[PDB]
Amino acid sequence: GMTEYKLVVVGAGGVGKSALTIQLIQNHFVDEYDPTIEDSYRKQVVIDGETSLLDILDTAGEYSAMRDQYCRTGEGFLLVFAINNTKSFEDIHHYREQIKRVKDSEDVPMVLVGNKSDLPSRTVDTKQAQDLARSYGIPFIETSAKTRQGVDDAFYTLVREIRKHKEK
């Protein structure tokens, strides 16, 4: 059989939300994608042997109508920052707090994603990010949309978090 999952990719503009999404759906790094495009994209993958239809909202900086739909009904959220942009890391909590204010339950599947791991000019270190993730009770995954490192882990881990929540 199959299962469908509604995922929402959030975070500051310029962190690589579109690049991560396009790696997952098209299997390559697209380095120029209009920063203002906010849209949903469907992709079928196989996760732990199960056909999984992912319905992914890639959010822009600006806020489209779909955004409220997917905030309301979204089953899991990728909180994305870039490891070379401290401001994007500091923005994470605003997004997490808003998701929590919208939802009824406090147990909302989320993964913290630190993107652009290929760049040498790091300003947020993995210890800082793991400490934030631990304070939220969620996984931290380091990614490079450019090389694909960690990208599949980030999305598949989020699906696994959703599955755990659905079992309750």
Ligand SMILES: Nc1nc2c(ncn2[C@@H]2O[C@H](COP(=O)(O)OP(=O)(O)O)[C@@H](O)[C@H]2O)c(=O)[nH]1
């Ligand atoms: N080096 C590197 N550049 C990236 C990575 N992900 C995104 N970019 C670049 O970062 C900028 C913003 O990416 P984009 O996908 O448009 O971010 P969004 O605004 O979060 O959707 C673009 O210039 C991308 O080429 C990455 O993992 N590594």
Ligand SMILES: *SCCCNC(=O)c1cnn(-c2ccc(OC)cc2)c1C(F)(F)F
């Ligand atoms: S699914 C819920 C998320 C959708 N996006 C927002 O709600 C949003 C848009 N802008 N912000 C935001 C950014 C920075 C800030 O302080 C510097 C406050 C708000 C958000 C929010 F973070 F609230 F989610």
Ligand SMILES: [Mg+2]
């Ligand atoms: Mg984008």
